[PDB]
Design an enzyme around this catalytic site. Structure first.
Site, PDB file in Angstrom:
ATOM      1  N   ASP A 168     -11.993   8.242  11.431  1.00  0.00           N
ATOM      2  CA  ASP A 168     -12.174   7.799   9.984  1.00  0.00           C
ATOM      3  C   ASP A 168     -12.291   6.296   9.639  1.00  0.00           C
ATOM      4  OD1 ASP A 168     -12.360   8.244   6.869  1.00  0.00           O
ATOM      5  OD2 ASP A 168      -9.986   7.920   7.131  1.00  0.00           O
ATOM      6  N   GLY A 220       0.952  -1.143   0.053  1.00  0.00           N
ATOM      7  CA  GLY A 220       0.071  -0.139  -0.090  1.00  0.00           C
ATOM      8  C   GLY A 220       0.883   1.313   0.016  1.00  0.00           C
ATOM      9  N   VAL A 222       3.553   1.020   2.650  1.00  0.00           N
ATOM     10  CA  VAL A 222       3.359  -0.113   3.531  1.00  0.00           C
ATOM     11  C   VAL A 222       4.008  -1.555   2.762  1.00  0.00           C
ATOM     12  CG1 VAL A 222       1.833  -1.685   5.002  1.00  0.00           C
ATOM     13  CG2 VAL A 222       1.349   0.850   4.546  1.00  0.00           C
ATOM     14  N   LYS A 276       6.092  -0.335   7.619  1.00  0.00           N
ATOM     15  CA  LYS A 276       5.597   1.150   7.202  1.00  0.00           C
ATOM     16  C   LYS A 276       6.723   1.903   7.472  1.00  0.00           C
ATOM     17  CE  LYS A 276       2.197   4.555   8.494  1.00  0.00           C
ATOM     18  NZ  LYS A 276       1.226   5.121   9.633  1.00  0.00           N
TER      19      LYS A 276
HETATM   20  C1  LIG Z   1      -0.575   9.820  12.522  1.00  0.00           C
HETATM   21  C2  LIG Z   1      -1.137   8.669  13.007  1.00  0.00           C
HETATM   22  C3  LIG Z   1      -1.394   7.764  11.765  1.00  0.00           C
HETATM   23  C4  LIG Z   1      -2.079   6.668  12.001  1.00  0.00           C
HETATM   24  C5  LIG Z   1      -2.392   6.038  13.466  1.00  0.00           C
HETATM   25  N1  LIG Z   1      -3.066   4.901  13.682  1.00  0.00           N
HETATM   26  N2  LIG Z   1      -3.877   4.918  14.676  1.00  0.00           N
HETATM   27  C6  LIG Z   1      -4.462   3.849  14.645  1.00  0.00           C
HETATM   28  C7  LIG Z   1      -5.547   3.396  15.458  1.00  0.00           C
HETATM   29  C8  LIG Z   1      -6.744   2.832  14.842  1.00  0.00           C
HETATM   30  C9  LIG Z   1      -5.209   2.373  16.697  1.00  0.00           C
HETATM   31  C10 LIG Z   1      -6.430   4.580  15.993  1.00  0.00           C
HETATM   32  C11 LIG Z   1      -3.915   2.918  14.045  1.00  0.00           C
HETATM   33  C12 LIG Z   1      -2.752   3.475  13.345  1.00  0.00           C
HETATM   34  N3  LIG Z   1      -1.880   3.161  12.312  1.00  0.00           N
HETATM   35  C13 LIG Z   1      -1.803   1.979  11.655  1.00  0.00           C
HETATM   36  O1  LIG Z   1      -2.567   1.257  11.766  1.00  0.00           O
HETATM   37  N4  LIG Z   1      -0.726   1.834  10.766  1.00  0.00           N
HETATM   38  C14 LIG Z   1      -0.637   0.884   9.981  1.00  0.00           C
HETATM   39  C15 LIG Z   1      -0.285   1.206   8.432  1.00  0.00           C
HETATM   40  O2  LIG Z   1      -0.227   2.884   8.334  1.00  0.00           O
HETATM   41  C16 LIG Z   1      -2.178   6.863  14.329  1.00  0.00           C
HETATM   42  C17 LIG Z   1      -1.318   8.179  13.966  1.00  0.00           C
END
Ligand SMILES: Cc1ccc(-n2nc(C(C)(C)C)cc2NC(=O)NCCO)cc1
EC number: 2.7.11.22
Lengths: 268, 326
Positions: free
Chosen positions: B142, B28, B35, B52
């Site tokens: 989102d 991705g 990713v 990532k």
């Molecule tokens: C800047 C930023 C981007 C993604 C996240 N984030 N947040 C979550 C939640 C669902 C637990 C809230 C998970 C993630 N990030 C990811 O799942 N990253 C995997 C591929 O990008 C946090 C902060």
């Protein structure tokens, strides 16, 4: 509304990795004690705790960001030696990173350096004759070393939230809080935040606040459920630091003490 | 700096290229970064990993936020950060996650119907995961089929993992955000879960719409499906910034025939089913009239036969296409 991971302390990286055993801390300290006395090492800690408070004030950051920047600084030098990275460089790096974590934003590359330079010149010229020697590329490099040693543990819990919750429960916010809050600030001059959960520090500070203003809270305290022997250890350290404070002329001693810190070995 | 310090840490530091095989395996290309599907070269692992590379260099807000949060978070249904690599050479940050072969976007794509044991299973683990984040005051902001990952073959067979990949679809956006509410809430997440649930029941995005926070056509579709709110259904609709604009552009009598019952009947879902009754408490227009994640989990829909399975596939063969490289 409420802040992220507010009630997760017991499953938190703070608790699980960054409450250290005291004996391990003093063991790793023995490296720097071949170049400094016991007395002189804690005087440094106070000094760089004041460096960090001044930086945070010049930048107009809230008290929670300053405490997080302080805990990062402590974490770093709990593990590694004073020779490792110049603590003049580490202190503004801790404020930089902490400011990104507490969600107040990236301090400008101009503003952070002007901050570092103006605070050492104005508030700290007694320990620093020369101007602030580092530029933003040194900050960016250091930040990378800081995040590595902390094992990316960024969220830090502090005594201010549980302190407010206890004093609300007492019904004495006007009477006891201003002073108890100030004692919490002062605890950052010591190792406490690496050795006791933040709620216990809170209670200890609340207890000293009660003794100072002569409010009887004997039964409120006994009605709580916690190891009081631990709270007594903290109260002893807080009382101790106020005698250290009294006998320590930061301004008349720190230039000599700073000269005794071990030297960062350069490349050959 | 001390030179012995620099060289000792340099020597000891684990590198991304040294421990992981990932070149060519780009799965991705998100807005936060790219990713990769990563095999562990050093012996003991046939398990795959999602790697990532955070976009930008250094520790941006994005980078610091993600690291900080996911380093603390621990639940079976939220995606888990295994390791952080900080690469000094080029100042790039790499994050190591558990690799997820599937997601609800590709699952819903493939059925263009899903078994109901699977739907109920998927919904319960979303509710479970979101509840955990919400207990920790962590809002997703989102939620949609592509952020609901599902683990393929291996020890976590069929387990939902909630993620945030990054990147126009306002299809999952609650009506208060369309009327210009400033803040994200827990209720905003739950609306989006209701949208995901309807889509799992019927395979069509409930509020599908053609391509300022105000969006007239996204609103029209919501009203076409759900019908126009009556004052009593949402008393503080009047407090919304775009309420004047709403009253200008729209007339309630346009949507007299329209309701949730009638939309869902048309797609072969019975309005006296427990499925439907929980869907209505999820897709409620007024946020303060929208039930919580805890409450949805208590709903007797999850007691009615068949029960939620831990494995969303319930033992069965996984017929879904694996991830293509880019
Ligand atoms: C800047 C930023 C981007 C993604 C996240 N984030 N947040 C979550 C939640 C669902 C637990 C809230 C998970 C993630 N990030 C990811 O799942 N990253 C995997 C591929 O990008 C946090 C902060």
């Amino acid at each position: 509304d409420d802040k992220a991971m507010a009630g997760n302390f017991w499953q938190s990286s703070h608790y699980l990795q960054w409450i250290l055993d005291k004996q391990d801390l003093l063991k790793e300290r023995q490296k720097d004690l071949k170049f400094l006395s016991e007395e002189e090492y804690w005087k440094l800690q106070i000094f760089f705790t004041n460096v960090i408070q001044a930086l945070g004030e010049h930048l107009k950051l809230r008290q929670q960001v300053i405490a997080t920047a302080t805990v990062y600084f402590k974490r770093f030098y709990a593990r590694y030696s004073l020779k490792s990275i110049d603590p003049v460089l580490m202190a503004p790096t801790c404020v930089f990173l902490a400011s990104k974590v507490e969600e107040f934003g990236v301090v400008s590359n101009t503003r952070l350096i002007a901050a570092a330079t103006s605070v050492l010149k104005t508030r700290f010229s007694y320990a620093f004759p020369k101007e602030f020697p580092y530029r933003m590329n040194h900050i960016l490099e250091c930040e990378f070393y800081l995040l590595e040693l902390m094992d990316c543990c960024l969220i830090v819990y502090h005594p201010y939230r549980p302190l407010l919750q206890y004093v609300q429960d007492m019904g004495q916010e006007d009477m006891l809080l201003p002073l108890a809050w100030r004692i919490v600030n002062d605890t950052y001059r010591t190792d406490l935040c690496l050795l006791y959960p933040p709620f216990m520090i809170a209670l200890a500070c609340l207890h000293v606040a009660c003794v100072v203003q002569q409010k009887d809270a004997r039964q409120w305290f006994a009605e709580l459920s916690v190891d009081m022997e631990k709270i007594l250890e903290i109260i002893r350290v807080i009382l101790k630091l106020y005698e250290q404070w009294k006998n320590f002329d930061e301004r008349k001693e720190m230039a000599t003490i700073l000269s005794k810190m071990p030297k960062p070995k350069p490349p050959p | 700096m001390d030179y012995d310090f620099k060289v000792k840490l340099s020597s000891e530091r684990e590198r991304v290229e040294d421990l992981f095989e990932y070149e060519g395996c780009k799965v991705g290309r998100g807005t936060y970064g790219h990713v990769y599907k990563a095999k562990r070269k050093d012996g003991k692992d046939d398990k795959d990993y999602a790697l990532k590379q955070i976009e930008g260099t250094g520790i941006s807000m994005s980078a610091c936020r993600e690291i900080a949060l996911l380093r603390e978070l621990k639940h079976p249904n939220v995606i888990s950060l295994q390791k952080v690599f900080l690469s000094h050479a080029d100042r790039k940050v790499w994050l190591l996650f558990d690799y997820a072969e599937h997601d609800l976007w590709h699952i819903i794509k493939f059925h263009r119907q899903l078994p109901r044991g699977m739907v109920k299973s998927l919904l319960y683990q979303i509710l479970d995961g979101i509840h955990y984040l919400h207990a920790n005051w962590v809002l997703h902001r989102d939620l949609k089929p592509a952020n609901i990952l599902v683990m393929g073959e291996g020890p976590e067979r069929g387990r939902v993992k909630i993620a945030d990949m990054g990147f126009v679809t306002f299809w999952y956006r609650a009506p208060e955000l369309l009327l210009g509410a400033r803040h994200y809430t827990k209720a905003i997440d739950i609306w989006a879960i209701g949208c995901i649930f309807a889509e799992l029941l019927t395979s069509e995005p409930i509020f599908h719409c053609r391509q300022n926070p105000y969006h007239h056509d996204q609103l029209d579709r919501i009203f076409n499906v759900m019908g126009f709110p009556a004052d009593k259904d949402w008393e503080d609709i009047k407090k919304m910034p775009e309420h004047s604009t709403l009253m200008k552009d729209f007339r309630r009598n346009t949507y007299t025939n329209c309701s949730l019952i009638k939309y869902m009947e048309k797609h072969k879902v019975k309005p006296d089913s427990k499925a439907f009754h929980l869907l209505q408490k999820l897709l409620t227009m007024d946020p303060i009239k929208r039930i919580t994640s805890e409450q949805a989990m208590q709903d007797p829909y999850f007691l009615e036969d068949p029960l939620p399975t831990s494995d969303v596939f319930a033992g069965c063969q996984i017929p879904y296409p694996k991830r293509e490289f880019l």
